[model samples]
Target: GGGELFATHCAGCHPQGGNTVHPEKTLARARREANGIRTVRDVAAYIRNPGPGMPAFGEAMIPPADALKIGEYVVASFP
Candidate 1:
């Protein structure tokens, strides 16, 4: 479920945990931690309210459940 959610919601910009918009800010463990995203909840929050360049996935679009899946997927797959 996490993988599916990631593919559908985040793969376009963060394929394989790599960042297309900002290579320095990849979803990889190291980069994510460097950017203060050290937990699954942080990732979920980031999905809902992201920084510049990355598009936000509001509750209406992804919902908190799917956002958590994407977060889990990113943390597990990238680690």
Candidate 2:
């Protein structure tokens, strides 16, 4: 699941169960957005080109297939 990637990259700032270090946004927000994110394609697109304030995972951090899996996990788990 996304936990591996989150642990490696995002966990430093947004701890799994703890509050985010930078902003107050919860993991639920990402999970919520991921629920409405629709498909793996959409998730991959977001991962490839995230908005400002969000970091791009890039090919090195997370490949497209894994990104899709992570996104699907978020949608299923959170929704």
Candidate 3:
């Protein structure tokens, strides 16, 4: 479910965890660490309120539970 959610909501901008708009901000382990996104909660927080170039995914767009799942999926899938 998280994988599918990511594909549907995030892949367009972060295809395969690679950022198309912000290459330096890709979701890879190194980048995530550098950006201080070391945990699933951090990832979900980012999704809830993304930085520039990323649209916000509020509860209306992605429920908090699903956001956590996507966060887990990203942390595992991106490596």
Candidate 4:
């Protein structure tokens, strides 16, 4: 689920095992970060209210329940 979101929003720029526009941050690195992000809340918060270039999905794109699910999916699948 998290990968789905990443693929839609992030992969256009990050791609698979290739140079990313955000040079220091790659998909594998993001998986590592996902491991550190301990809870579903963390994922939801980050995804719902991200920094620049990231669009918020708080209530617009993703509902709270789906966000939590996506978060857990990230933690489980990515790392």
Listed in order, each prediction's TM-score against the native is 0.93, 0.57, 0.95, 0.58
Predicted candidate 1 versus true structure: per-residue lDDT over 1-79, tens digit per residue: 9999888878888888898998888887988899899888999998877889888889999888888887888898996
Counting clashing residue pairs in each candidate, in order, gives 0, 0, 0, 0
RMSD to truth, every model: 0.9, 3.7, 0.7, 3.9
What's the true lDDT of residue 12 in model 3?
Answer: 100
lDDT of 4: 0.60
lDDT of 1: 0.86
Q: Which is the better candidate, 1 or 4, if ranked by TM-score?
A: 1
For candidate 2, the 10 contiguous residues with the lowest summed lDDT are 17-26
State which candidate has the highest TM-score.
3
Clashes of 3: 0
The 10-residue segment with the lowest total lDDT in model 4? 17-26
Q: Write the per-residue lDDT of candidate 3 for residues 1-79, one digit (tens) a residue.
A: 9999999999999999999998889999988989899899999998877889899999987998999999999999998
Question: Which ranges in model 2 have alpha carbons more than 4 Å from their true place?
Answer: 10-36
What ordering of candidates by TM-score runs from best to worst?
3, 1, 4, 2
The worst-scoring run of ten residues by lDDT in candidate 1 lies at 65-74
lDDT digits (tens) for residues 2-78 of candidate 2: 66755665557556533354354444646435545556567666667765567787877787778877766544444
